[PDB]
Amino acid sequence: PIKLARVTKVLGRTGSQGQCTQVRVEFMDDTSRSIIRNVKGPVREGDVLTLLESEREARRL
Amino acid sequence: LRYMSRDDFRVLTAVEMGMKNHEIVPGSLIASIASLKHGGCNKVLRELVKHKLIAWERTKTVQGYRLTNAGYDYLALKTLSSRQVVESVGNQMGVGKESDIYIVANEEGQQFALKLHRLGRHNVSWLYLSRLSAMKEFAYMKALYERKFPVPKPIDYNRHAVVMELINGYPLCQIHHVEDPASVYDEAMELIVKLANHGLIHGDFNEFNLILDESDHITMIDFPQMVSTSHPNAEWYFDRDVKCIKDFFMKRFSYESELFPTFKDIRREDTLDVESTIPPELVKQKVKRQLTKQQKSAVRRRLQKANIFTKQRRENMQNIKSSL
RNA sequence: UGUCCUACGCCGGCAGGCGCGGGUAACCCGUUGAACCCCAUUCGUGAUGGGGAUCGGGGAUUGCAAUUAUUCCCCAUGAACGAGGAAUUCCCAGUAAGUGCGGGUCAUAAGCUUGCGUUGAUUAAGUCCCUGCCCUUUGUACACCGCGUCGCU
RNA sequence: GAAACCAAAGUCUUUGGGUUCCGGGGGGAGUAUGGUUGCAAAGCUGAAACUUAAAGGAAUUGACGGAAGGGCACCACCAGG
């Protein structure tokens, strides 16, 4: 199962070398699940993503 | 080379014991803990600094001596010679920035190899990490030779130095033509299967690390980086090594592969991934130990008595008198 | 850049000689007539015609002198080299890199050094992980317990 | 008062209210011996030979932290050439 995504707000830069971006993700399954994920590469406010799995949640707390 | 063999051992081991607790060792500690000869040790240290055995260190107040790399190498070689392992030196230098290869010959004349770990904050961390690397490398060679892998026989080790079995040959990179590529290639996947069976995956299994003993035997060395198969990335390292060997064989010898082993078999072999009742003699020994302890404390507190400050004060007083 | 820089013609395979002119210089070299690049031919995945060293002969300059090849030119021999580990250098947009040109000691000697133009990108616009460096706060003027046996005067 | 501090550690070279115990550079050493008490463990009294140029007490700055926080750099890294 592959689910579509959306960028709501870019939060910050995480990782050892500052290579990852911690971002907030809104779902295109008409749900309001805003889940905080980690992405690699350049992202801006308004980008659209392809998640291989959605049940995993990134590093929160 | 060495000519006199009386007290450089004791002074240099005193320096080694000084390095184990702190950076720069004063001469008072050396004179206290090397007490066989007294008074003449200053000229001994003056004789050592004419070589690259020890080095002086007097910046602004700290005044001491430290051990160099060559002094540590000669200390290990002297400890090997005490074990009757090295008599003469073969000058076939394998000059690497991570390790130095020196041929050695025993009293019998049989030649062995000598690996001296040179790792490149000051050099005490370099020597300590060289010691740890030599220890873990000797442990890995012992494990691999116990598991009958085609590796040389380990012989001895002293604190960075490894006396190791000598097998002559060339690495697989600089051998342009191989008469029988298929047999040694099948043996290469056999060794890959054996390593993966032994709960181990190399990660950087390179052709440069493979030495062709007369282009007939495979010699394998250099295991400080050896990792586990319990890691989730283990099969990715294993497949990287397999594809590296494959692309090297279809790229360099123009020989195409016939067998394609992609087996992860753990762990059907040994898991190497972790790898007046008291007699008077005792009374005499204990009382002698006590009195040597008080006299060693006395020697410490007597040898701990900066003349540079007194010289500067005298010069300042003389300048104040001659200028005013 | 230049009084050694060369325009033109002839003899020249060819480096080069011969007769002639300019330039002490936005003038003459010089619309500086560049090179990759482009457009057509042949070669066709092999130590190949790729790659050119190392040698053998001649020729012509430079210089009082080229023998230990100064340099270049004409044939011939074709070596290693099959994309290079551990490790390491440099690099943010006319940038790296490829490509040629000019200056430097100089009689001929330039794989060095320094600038210039031409074609022109990938990635990033983030961090203290590694390597260091720079500040702020903060305490501080090698203690103890875990190296020996025997031998004669 | 050497000071930290102290209404007492004050009324001290402007030194005397009565009186008890007790110290004399650091070790040897609270050791040996002797006496005494105790079932014992040990308690009380207690040296010398010798060794040593020092040991200590108060405060004052802060190399060096294996102490912690920030910032900067392709002569550091990340993604790359």
UniProtKB/Swiss-Prot annotation, chain A:
Component of the 40S small ribosomal subunit. Part of the small subunit (SSU) processome, composed of more than 70 proteins and the RNA chaperone small nucleolar RNA (snoRNA) U3. Its main location: cytoplasm. It comes from the Eukaryota. InterPro entries: NA-bd_OB-fold, Ribosomal_eS28, Ribosomal_eS28_CS. This is Small ribosomal subunit protein eS28. Component of the small ribosomal subunit. The ribosome is a large ribonucleoprotein complex responsible for the synthesis of proteins in the cell. Part of the small subunit (SSU) processome, first precursor of the small eukaryotic ribosomal subunit. During the assembly of the SSU processome in the nucleolus, many ribosome biogenesis factors, an RNA chaperone and ribosomal proteins associate with the nascent pre-rRNA and work in concert to generate RNA folding, modifications, rearrangements and cleavage as well as targeted degradation of pre-ribosomal RNA by the RNA exosome. The keyword Metal-binding does not apply. Transmembrane segments: none annotated. GO terms for molecular function: RNA binding; structural constituent of ribosome. PROSITE patterns: RIBOSOMAL_S28E. Pfam families: Ribosomal_S28e (PF01200). Belongs to the eukaryotic ribosomal protein eS28 family. One of its GO terms (biological process) is ribosomal small subunit biogenesis. GO terms for cellular component: cytoplasm; cytoplasmic side of rough endoplasmic reticulum membrane; cytosol; cytosolic small ribosomal subunit; extracellular exosome; nucleolus; nucleoplasm; ribosome. It is linked to Diamond-Blackfan anemia 15, with mandibulofacial dysostosis: A form of Diamond-Blackfan anemia, a congenital non-regenerative hypoplastic anemia that usually presents early in infancy. Diamond-Blackfan anemia is characterized by a moderate to severe macrocytic anemia, erythroblastopenia, and an increased risk of malignancy. 30 to 40% of Diamond-Blackfan anemia patients present with short stature and congenital anomalies, the most frequent being craniofacial (Pierre-Robin syndrome and cleft palate), thumb and urogenital anomalies. Disulfide bonds: none annotated.
From Swiss-Prot, chain B:
Belongs to the protein kinase superfamily. RIO-type Ser/Thr kinase family. Its cofactor is Mg(2+). It comes from Homo sapiens. GO terms for molecular function: ATP binding; metal ion binding; protein kinase activity; protein serine kinase activity; protein serine/threonine kinase activity. PROSITE patterns: RIO1. Signal peptide: none annotated. It comes from the Eukaryota. This is Serine/threonine-protein kinase RIO2.
